[PDB]
Symmetry: C2
Subunit: 304 residues, 2 copies
């Protein structure tokens, strides 16, 4: 069995790659950047915005993890091509080359400001960022390809995933900020925003379990939340990171939106319900939001 | 107040145009084909697949009705560009040029094989065609633009709309078939498929009412079903059309899918719930599905 991982060189994807090699799969990495970790993995540099990206590339299953992950309105076209056109180009390659299954990296942002927290998968699409819209659009398209062409689609709605090699997000930004100036930490928003953080090891294991189980179901489409069970405030994240570095910076709140978000489209409060994932797979997290945040801070502290 | 109508030269759009001129609006028509009916309407030939389509075009409200309406899998990229990229290009023009409102032509296909018939707007996206996916994707994007940029979005989910100038769909196809050969009528599917048909006059009036009322609400996004209250079987449509023409053709059923659909992705049974539309606006249909079908047959019979 051949597994293609798009975005294989990036954060979650690379972890996915390593784990798939170990378990015995013939792994194909497709990414716009090079990563030459060793291993069995057949390497391809391609741009998924190109319809013809997958020429001469063959797999039975694709993990589609190529995207631009940054939520931060100003340049929606880049989001559009990177997140919408690229996903369509993946699904067209899957259709025409006999790929059986798509595992799609989705996101908690598909829910927007959710009406129920912890958020169940039954909650409707209400995204508030162009990135959330692009993920929801991707989900709809991959589900349709499932129903119409039999390219079954597991949409995995990730909350924040944190660990070694992460190069985006609050922990990474906070660390990079204190590196430039240790005395001041600018924090976007009103400091009160609260989100779950799942350590990468836990995320990978929930993803692979859910995939295995999806394969023994026959629903054309399944959407599954993969996140932690608790949340951490941004101010608490600021302290954890500061402590790891041995620092006590001046915390400067940056006003941005009437309602205290860090930027327009920033969801302030998020925790996903992981009942379905637990039920279906027997998966549990091995860390809390706080522990995952601290461990990642330590990881990125030594890398960066 | 300036109203831009994309797809202004086509079936629903042109009717929308004429009606908007009468009521006093400064109307701007944007379409890839020319239509020179007279009137106040400022005319533009543009391709909405072009990001720069709306250069020098200004409006306070857009009715976005430019699309490829054909559901009939084989060429999804054309659907993608025509229905997804074009809608994104409209929304980007609306954002950057101070447009206040989008009226988006959506479709009953966003529901797929609906679990409840008549289908309420609360029913989730389960499209079974690439066209349905593209409409659902459009809805998600325009809703997000509403929430994020204040470009409020009325998504109008049309069931079949039928009348003068219609050049696609079953009635048009049946007529064109009997014109080529009056003795044989090929009917796709198992003949049992059942759908509502709303006469164009009724559709236009429900659209303009819902728009007026949407403007006095403050929900960023509203999705509204606009359809008839009853359905007609394809075989009954075949007879109505045949009778209008004075004909009794041999009815030949064409097998296509294990489950009797005319093609993969063809929804067999559809009727939308129009409670919300009635409640909000005091709108009623003036015809039945059967009457609208017969009247359209007569209309297209004399045009074609
Ligand atoms: N990390 C999280 O917390 C999280 C949460 C929710 C969803 N996700 C989704 O997980 C997936 C990856 O997340 P990540 O954090 O690893 O980000 P990342 O940036 O580390 O990984 C993405 C990889 O995609 C590649 N890529 C981008 N555009 C490409 C293109 N056009 N063609 C080929 N390759 C391209 C990038 O080079 C990168 O290596 C994305 O879909 C992301 O939106 C991540
Ligand atoms: N007619 C119905 O029963 C019905 C039902 C549900 C939804 N809708 C939606 O209503 C809208 C119009 O339906 P219709 O039946 O009038 O179809 P139509 O083909 O008569 O009208 C569409 C118009 O869009 C124009 N167009 C297409 N691509 C374009 C582009 N790239 N740039 C500029 N113009 C372009 C076409 O030239 C045409 O004049 C579409 O969004 C359709 O999907 C119609
Ligand atoms: O430099 C920063 C960066 C972020 N924040 C704030 O702290 C919170 C950070 O929350 P997240 O950890 O969720 O970071 P993002 O909002 O950037 O992450 C979002 O995008 C991710 C991918 O980048 C995932 O999709 C994830 O599901 C989604 O929450 C936000 O409310 C933000 O306002 C700051 O104050 N300063
Ligand atoms: O030549 C034909 C054409 C259609 N049919 C059958 O009769 C039914 C026709 O139903 P519709 O009137 O709904 O026609 P479409 O399925 O082509 O229309 C669909 O696409 C439309 C735009 O083209 C609208 O979006 C509408 O909501 C959606 O039902 C279908 O089940 C189809 O299988 C035939 O037998 N022969």
């Amino acid at each position: 069995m051949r597994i293609v991982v798009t975005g294989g060189a990036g954060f979650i994807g690379s972890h996915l790659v390593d784990k798939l090699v170990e378990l015995g799969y013939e792994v194909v990495v497709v990414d716009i950047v090079q990563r030459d970790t060793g291993g069995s993995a057949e390497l391809h540099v391609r741009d998924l915005k190109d319809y013809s990206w997958g020429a001469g590339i063959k797999g039975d299953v694709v993990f589609h993890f190529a995207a631009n992950p940054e939520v931060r309105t100003t340049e929606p076209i880049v989001h559009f091509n990177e997140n919408v056109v690229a996903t369509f180009n993946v699904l067209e390659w899957a259709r025409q080359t006999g790929v059986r299954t798509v595992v799609f990296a989705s996101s908690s942002t598909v829910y927007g400001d959710a009406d129920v927290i912890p958020t169940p998968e039954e909650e409707p699409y209400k995204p508030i960022s162009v990135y959330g819209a692009a993920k929801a659009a991707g989900e709809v398209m991959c589900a349709t390809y499932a129903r119409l062409f039999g390219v079954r689609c597991l949409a995995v709605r990730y909350a924040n995933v944190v660990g070694p090699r992460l190069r985006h997000g609050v922990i990474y930004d906070f660390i990079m900020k204190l590196r430039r100036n240790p005395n001041v930490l600018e924090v976007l928003g009103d400091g009160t925003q609260r989100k779950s953080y799942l350590y990468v090891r836990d995320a990978v294991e929930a993803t692979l379990a859910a995939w295995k189980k999806f394969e023994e179901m026959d629903a054309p489409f399944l959407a599954l939340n993969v996140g932690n069970v608790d949340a951490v405030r941004v101010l608490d994240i600021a302290q954890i990171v500061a402590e790891v570095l041995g620092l006590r910076p001046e915390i400067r709140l940056v006003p941005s939106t009437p309602d205290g978000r860090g930027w327009p489209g920033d969801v302030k409060y998020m925790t996903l319900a992981v009942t379905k994932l637990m039920k279906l797979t027997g998966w549990r997290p091995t860390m809390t939001s706080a522990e995952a945040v601290k461990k990642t801070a330590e990881d990125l502290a030594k890398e960066l």
